[PDB]
């Protein structure tokens, strides 16, 4: 509860690896939004270790643009090790994870001329670039799976695989069959093998909706129903057991944050957002305003760190 004083000169004799940790360990006492990072790190680290498979659960909510960045490889390590219990992300959070098995995302610059990027077939994601050929290959991978799912839903009275959870789970299965080499580097694949449900209620908002629109223009049938995913996400977020320590890691606050914390009863929450309270939105993570709306319980441990999750999340997920 007090700001510390670190002798940086004392780091010259200790090892360089431990030196960088000596500061990151002191982050809870540095001040301002490093304290909130240090508090968030203590919550995330203890949750990723204790809440593996002991009546406890860890649920990850990330925005779509953060698996366009390199964090998707870090997120994959979490689901690969069965540390995550559930995933909540907008449609793009599922798409580009499968995309980056069919191609590479490149680093660019915010200053790049977007008109020239169009004439050069480059889709800009902030300071990143996704070539159009990546989505041309995604069409080759996804539109067959849509035809498989249509036949599967049609001959089953439209009630066997209608929700995004089952669809995303079979996306990892189809990624295991089609591309057995690169599938090990995708978050959706490990969520299929480790049996981690992925939730994306706004499913058609993205490239997947475009693939569905192209397929549904000739074969009108394939449908999606996201309301059972709400009952499903609520089923996984029910601590009547009273021996549940259920932590929610929300990296980037969009539809993931609300859809997760509204249906899941979390004992510990970590916000990594950038929006400001002046927006008056369900993204500008306001701790006490979320408590008033039922997103945070009055007895819930919660911390909010303000900054780009590209800088925050690696320091939070850094294993000690």
């Amino acid at each position: 509860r007090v700001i510390g004083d670190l002798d940086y000169s004392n780091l010259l004799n200790i090892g360089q690896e431990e030196a960088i940790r000596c500061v990151l360990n002191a982050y809870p006492n540095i001040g301002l939004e490093a304290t909130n990072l240090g508090r968030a790190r203590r919550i995330v680290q203890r949750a990723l270790n204790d809440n593996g498979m002991d009546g406890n659960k860890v649920m990850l909510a990330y925005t779509s643009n953060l698996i366009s960045s390199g964090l998707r490889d870090t997120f994959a390590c979490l689901a690969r090790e069965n540390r995550i219990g559930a995933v909540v992300t907008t449609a793009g959070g599922v798409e580009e994870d499968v995309i980056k098995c069919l191609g590479d995302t490149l680093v660019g610059d915010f200053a790049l001329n977007d008109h020239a990027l169009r004439n050069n077939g480059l889709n800009r994601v902030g300071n990143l670039l996704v070539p159009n050929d990546n989505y041309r290959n995604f069409e080759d991978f996804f539109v067959p799976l849509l035809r498989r799912l249509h036949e599967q839903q049609r001959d089953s009275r439209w009630t066997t695989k209608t929700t995004p959870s089952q669809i995303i789970a079979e996306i990892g299965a189809a990624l295991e069959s089609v591309r057995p080499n690169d599938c090990g580097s995708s978050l959706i694949y490990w969520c299929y093998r480790n049996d981690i449900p992925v939730f994306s209620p706004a499913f058609t908002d993205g490239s997947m909706g475009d693939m569905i629109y192209f397929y549904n223009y000739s074969r009108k049938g394939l449908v999606v129903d996201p309301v059972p995913d709400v009952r499903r996400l609520r089923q996984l977020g029910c601590k009547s057991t009273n021996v549940g320590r259920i932590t929610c890691i929300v990296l980037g606050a969009g539809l993931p944050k609300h859809h997760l914390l509204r249906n899941v009863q979390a004992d510990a929450v970590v916000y990594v957002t950038t929006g400001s309270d002046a927006d008056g939105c369900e993204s500008s993570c306001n701790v006490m305003a979320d408590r008033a709306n039922g997103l945070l319980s009055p007895n819930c441990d919660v911390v909010r760190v303000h900054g780009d999750a590209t800088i925050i999340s690696p320091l939070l997920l850094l294993r000690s």
Binding site: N65, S68, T90, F110, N113, D114, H115, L117, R118, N123, R124, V125, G126, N127, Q153, R154, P201, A202, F203, T204, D205, G209, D210, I212, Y213, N216, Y217, R219, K220, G221, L222, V223, V224, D225, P226, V227, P228, D229, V230, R231, R234, G254, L255, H258, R262, T274, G275, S276, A278, D279, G280, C281, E282, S283, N286, A289, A292, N293, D308, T310
Partner: protein
């Protein structure tokens, strides 16, 4: 041109002030460009590279229906100007929009705020819920409150109508017809808004007289954006409907034995991406960001870009999001054309959006009338 601000003479009329925003720097010039681009969306002209009036796709943040923007968006759905004789419009939820706007893409919880403001009144600061300095009261899911009764009648009406079409139909002519799509759900809600209020006003006990409840129900129903959206026929798309307050009623209405409703998102993306594909000149006004912004831009992607765009939000570019993206980032994907004119007004919506509606939209419908 030279930088000149509100003078001595032209500080006495708001028109000249809002007109001189062009020569005032920073975000007043962006707002003045937003004025012009909105008027360009309203000017009948030739299709993209036989005059047409552009079809306007407007996307709204959910919480923005809790504030006074609900009043202005209602105006965009209410008033309608007949198209001139020599201009053609660029051509279950219908798509026949005779109004200023033609498509409405809203976030989850938006229309729930639209419903809830004709039942009770939203209070301001200086159990009750917060979204900034505004406060509303979301009562229990199975409460006696007016909002809970309206939303229960809605869900019950939808469930009973879904069963009838299910029992009715129990390759290319084999669709899941009993599934209800977000555009149809809010459309039917606008049709039923009159009768649903009259029935809820009785079940709550505020007015037991059938006559007064019928008249007061219509008065409360006419105030919602859903009513005029259904009356004039603008479709209210919402792929994020699955994350709204309405799901609290849809889920527990299934806790009494009856199955949950069955949504469909493929019908929405088809109708939306087809209204944009078959369009010949399109406009785009996005209030805020998030799901609503990407959904409108992705719809116009099927038309190799949109012509006009105005982004009113308070989001930043450094986080690499589709909410804080610059207007440039749209043309790289192809969601916004090369021969386009767009602008982003970096400011809170509630400050800039009223000015826009009153300064061009109210003035344009008066010039044409």
């Amino acid at each position: 041109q030279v930088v000149v601000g509100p003078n001595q003479e032209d500080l006495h009329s708001a028109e000249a002030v809002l007109n001189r925003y062009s020569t005032v720097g920073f975000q007043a010039s962006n707002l003045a460009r937003a004025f012009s681009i909105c008027e360009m969306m309203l000017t009948p002209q030739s299709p993209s590279p036989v005059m047409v009036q552009p079809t306007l796709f407007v996307g709204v943040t959910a919480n923005l229906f809790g504030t006074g923007c609900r009043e202005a968006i209602r105006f965009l759905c209410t008033e309608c100007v007949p198209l001139p004789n020599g201009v053609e419009p660029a051509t279950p939820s219908p798509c026949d929009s005779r109004a200023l706007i033609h498509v409405l893409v809203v976030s989850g919880g938006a229309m729930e705020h639209d419903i809830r403001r004709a039942c009770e009144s939203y209070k301001l600061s200086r159990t009750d819920c917060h979204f900034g300095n505004v406060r509303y009261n979301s009562s229990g899911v199975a409460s006696r409150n007016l909002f809970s009764c309206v939303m229960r009648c809605l869900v019950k009406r939808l469930a009973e109508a879904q069963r009838k079409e299910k029992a009715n139909r129990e390759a290319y002519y084999d669709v899941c017809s009993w599934a209800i799509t977000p555009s149809t759900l809010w459309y039917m809600a606008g049709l039923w808004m009159a009768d649903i209020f009259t029935e809820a006003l009785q079940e709550t006990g505020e007015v037991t007289d059938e006559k007064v409840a019928s008249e007061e129900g219509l008065k409360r129903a006419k105030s919602t954006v859903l009513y005029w959206a259904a009356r004039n026929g603008v479709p209210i798309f919402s792929p994020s409907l699955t994350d709204g307050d309405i799901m609290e009623f849809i889920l527990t209405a299934g806790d009494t034995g009856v199955p949950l409703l069955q949504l469909d998102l493929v019908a929405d993306i088809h109708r939306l991406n087809r209204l944009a594909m078959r369009s010949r000149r399109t406009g785009m006004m996005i209030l805020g960001g998030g799901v609503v912004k990407h959904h409108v831009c992705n719809a116009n992607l099927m038309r190799n870009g949109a012509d006009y765009a105005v982004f009113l939000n308070n989001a930043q570019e450094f986080d690499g999001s589709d909410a804080g993206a610059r207007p440039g980032e749209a043309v790289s994907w192809g969601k916004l054309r090369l021969d386009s004119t767009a602008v982003k007004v970096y400011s809170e919506v509630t400050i800039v959006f009223p000015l826009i509606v009153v300064h061009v939209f109210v003035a344009w419908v008066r010039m044409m009338r």
